[PDB]
């Protein structure tokens, strides 16, 4: 029901999974701290900096119209009507920063393309989206899963793991993710034992059956997963439950999330996981940690996040005690992707403005209204700038390929039992046009 709106000369639409998927009865579930709130605030942070950037649209203010998908594609669409309501007779949406889940980005793309509205995803990695015959107004700051699968299979060949199995979740991402793995596997002389399917509706018993099924072919110790966080979580819990031992090789969904493993550490010990290569942003941590319910009114959902986060109630008046500065900050992995995606849309508009409004620094009649086709084809796809807030070590550019995709850069991790019974994720290498490993950091190596 709620929308986040910010004034500006040009309004960018946003789309985030602020809430999780609801019950069979309800549309929306509880608040998403990391993939919801933190990702939405990275958008707000980025627009704030952009609006204080002298070399980036100094005469044009970037406004916002941010929607909640509730982690369900059909819901994302009901909301997404806002972006197009004016045209079908918000006054004007210049472009959409959004889609977390591939299924959401695909659904929203199918509508946005009917209105020539450009779209940039910060998280969607299904290979389908690379097709400009169907998703001709879609671009992403992340690479497709074509390269993730290619990396996963390359790890197996290096470790001489010829017999292995697969799990994967219902949805565009997982299903189309594991086929890409199996294809790259077969090309490397890698056999598949069993190929399993997992849903969210699936209960404790059904997850145990998957683990049971993976044992039927015991010559395959290594399990390859292209699953959602909560599916990886469950399958890992089911493993500790009936004391099962697998060599997990898992996709970005699990990545280096402590939540996926928390509680089922023993079973997880030794897993090799993929996280799309990114870096933290120190300015964003400071920004997020300084947010409070009385000073962050512009976020319609922040008070709900706060009650949930600090098990308090504003009615009860027990929320003021708490503070984000006094708790351990853990930035979400794809925050870089959210900032990059916001900056990419801003660079595109600046570049469009340079070309269409030569005399004035302000929004001229040529960009009233902005032509989406022209914007996407000639400006979005042709941006080339140094990624903001990047470390001194890496020199990353924000650029789109022919298919609107990002560069196939991934970080490889291992989960290990560290000192004094603590468990942690360690960076063992990276995949950027070939595998790169340091097995010294790998315990079982």
Ligand X SMILES: N[C@@]1(C(=O)O)C[C@@H](Sc2nc[nH]n2)[C@H]2[C@H](C(=O)O)[C@H]21
Ligand Y SMILES: *[C@@H]1O[C@H](CO)[C@@H](O)[C@H](O)[C@H]1NC(C)=O
Q: Which residues are annotated as a binding site for L-glutamate?
A: 35, 39, 102, 123, 125, 252, 334
215 binds its own copies (CB under 8 A): no
Taking CB under 8 A as the binding criterion, the range among 72-80, 223-231, 266-274, 430-438 that sits at the site for its own copies is 72-80
If phi > 0 it is left, if psi is from -120 to 50 it is alpha, else beta; for residue 10 that is beta
Per-residue x/- marks for its own copies, 115-154, CB under 8 A? ------------------xx--------------------
Preceding peptide of 369 cis, ω within 30°: yes
**Nearer Cβ to ligand X (125/331):** 125
Tell me whether strands 247-250 and 222-226 are parallel, antiparallel or unpaired.
parallel
Q: Does an H or E element contain 241, and which?
A: helix 229-241
What residue 88 binds from its own copies, ligand Y, ligand X, none (CB within 5 to 8 A, per partner kind)?
its own copies
What residue 100 binds from ligand Y, ligand X, its own copies, none (CB within 5 to 8 A, per partner kind)?
ligand X
**Nearer Cβ to ligand X (100/414):** 100
Q: Smallest gap, in angstroms, from Cβ of residue 139 to ligand X? A: 14
CA 215 to chain centre: 32
85 binds its own copies (CB under 8 A): yes
What residue 49 binds from ligand Y, ligand X, its own copies, none (CB within 5 to 8 A, per partner kind)?
none
**Nearer Cβ to its own copies (377/417):** 377
What residue 323 binds from ligand Y, its own copies, ligand X, none (CB within 5 to 8 A, per partner kind)?
none
d(CA 374, CA 413): 41
Q: Smallest gap, in angstroms, from Cβ of residue 189 to its own copies? A: 14
Structure tokens at 435: 């595998």
The tally of CA atoms less than 13 A away on the side-chain side of residue 26 is: 11
203 binds its own copies (CB under 8 A): no
What residue 189 binds from its own copies, ligand X, ligand Y, none (CB within 5 to 8 A, per partner kind)?
none
**Nearer Cβ to ligand X (62/257):** 257
Which has the closest alpha carbon to 192: 212, 170, 227, 167? 167
What residue 160 binds from its own copies, ligand X, ligand Y, none (CB within 5 to 8 A, per partner kind)?
ligand Y
**Nearer Cβ to its own copies (172/405):** 172
d(CA 94, CA 344): 13
d(CA 228, CA 213): 19
Helices (H), 357-409: 372-374
d(CA 163, CA 144): 26
Taking CB under 8 A as the binding criterion, the range among 110-118, 161-169, 288-296, 413-421 that sits at the site for its own copies is 110-118
d(CA 291, CA 289): 6
For binding to ligand X (CB under 6 A), which residues are involved?
35, 100-102, 123-126, 173, 228-229, 252-253, 334
**Nearer Cβ to its own copies (25/205):** 25
CB 276 within 8 A of CB 254: no
d(CA 382, CA 375): 10
């Amino acid at each position: 029901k709620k929308v986040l709106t910010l004034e500006g000369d040009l309004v960018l639409g946003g789309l985030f999974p602020v809430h999780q998927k609801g019950g069979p009865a309800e549309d929306c579930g509880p608040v998403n701290e990391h993939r919801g709130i933190q990702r939405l605030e990275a958008m707000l942070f980025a627009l704030d900096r952009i609006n204080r950037d002298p070399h980036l649209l100094p005469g044009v203010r970037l406004g916002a119209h941010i929607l909640d998908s509730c982690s369900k594609d059909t819901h994302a669409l009901e909301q997404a009507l806002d972006f197009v309501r004016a045209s079908l007779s918000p006054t004007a949406i210049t472009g959409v920063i959004g889609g977390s889940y591939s299924d959401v980005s695909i659904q929203v793309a199918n509508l946005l393309r009917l209105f020539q509205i450009p779209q940039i995803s910060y998280a969607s990695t299904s290979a389908k989206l690379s097709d400009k015959s169907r998703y001709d107004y879609f671009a992403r700051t992340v690479p497709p899963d074509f390269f993730q699968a290619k990396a996963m299979a390359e790890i197996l060949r290096f470790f001489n793991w010829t017999y292995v199995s697969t799990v994967a979740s219902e949805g565009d991402y997982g299903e189309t993710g594991i086929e890409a793995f199996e294809l790259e596997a077969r090309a490397r002389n890698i056999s598949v034992a069993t190929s399993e399917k997992v849903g969210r509706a699936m209960s404790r018993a059904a997850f145990e059956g998957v683990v049971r099924a993976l044992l039927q072919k015991p010559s395959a110790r290594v399990a390859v997963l292209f699953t959602r966080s909560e599916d990886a979580r469950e399958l890992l819990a089911a493993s500790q439950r009936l004391n099962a031992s697998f060599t997990w090789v898992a996709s970005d969904g699990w990545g280096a999330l402590e939540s996926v493993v928390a509680g089922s550490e023993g079973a997880a010990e030794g897993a090799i996981t993929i996280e799309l290569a990114s870096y933290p942003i120190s300015d964003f941590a400071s920004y997020f940690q300084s947010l409070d319910p009385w000073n962050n009114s512009r976020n319609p959902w922040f008070r709900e996040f706060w009650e949930q986060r600090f098990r308090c109630s504003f009615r009860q008046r027990d929320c003021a005690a708490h503070s984000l500065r006094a708790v351990p900050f853990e930035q979400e992995s794809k925050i870089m992707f959210v900032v990059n995606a916001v900056y990419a849309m801003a660079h595109a508009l600046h570049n469009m403005h340079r070309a269409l409004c030569p005399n004035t620094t302000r929004l001229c009649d040529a960009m009233r209204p902005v032509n989406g086709r022209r914007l996407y084809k000639d400006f979005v796809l042709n941006v080339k700038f140094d990624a903001p807030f990047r470390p001194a070590d890496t020199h990353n550019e924000v650029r789109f390929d022919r298919f609107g995709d990002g560069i196939g850069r991934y970080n490889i991790f291992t989960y290990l039992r560290a000192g004094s019974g603590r468990y942690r994720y360690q960076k063992v290498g990276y995949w950027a046009e070939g595998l790169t490993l340091d097995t010294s950091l790998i315990p079982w190596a």
